[PDB]
Structure 1
């Protein structure tokens, strides 16, 4: 049952090395893992909403409280960007 929801991603700037929220809203897709093996609510994102001059694409997101660390706030001035980082390079940032 790949359900669908509405959230946002997080673009990064190499000139300042920062992770701000993307102006595009797009949407996510709740998924019960590829075959309900890890019970991981795979969240598939995709440009299916109203963008703002920034063309994006589908981004497979994962949710594991026992593997990827949950980062709702990165100290300093920050609204609410839920970012999950594992250890190698599977670290994505999201904002609602």
Structure 2
């Protein structure tokens, strides 16, 4: 079970900008045992800052062929982890991993190799 700081984020299909509503909390990601492809439970929990929008716990599964990641979708923020579900359960998350601050840095964090392995890894394989 691998946990990191993350905020909730507001999505857009409007022009695909995806403007954050910053918050504070932890993402809890569970390694499960479900399947042999996709199927990682993304459950999000607040710790602090009830201001802006809030997301109570929802498990979200990694659905291959509907979920795509990129870190910039607008270049107004980076560190984005995108879970694309065509608005059937869509919610976006904004990582706030402290290693260089909670301020966004484009092309994810400043500990590149460590975050990159995960991001590619959830799509490819499962436990």
TM bucket, shorter chain = 0.5 to 0.7
User: Which 5+ residue runs of structure 1 have no aligned equivalent?
Assistant: none
Distance 2:93 2:37 in 1: 22
Name the TM-score, length of structure 2 as normaliser: 0.49
Query: How far is 1:44 from its partner?
Result: 0.6
User: Which 5+ residue runs of structure 2 have no aligned equivalent?
Assistant: 95-127
Distance 1:66 1:26 in 2: 28
Q: Which runs of 4+ in 1 moved over 6 A?
A: 13-17
Higher RCO (C-alpha 8 Å, min separation 6): 2
Name the TM-score, length of structure 1 as normaliser: 0.60
Higher strand share: 1
Name the count of aligned residue pairs. Answer: 94
Higher helix share: 2
Deviations 1:52-94 (A, max 9, x none): 4654422323335554111321145343322121345233211
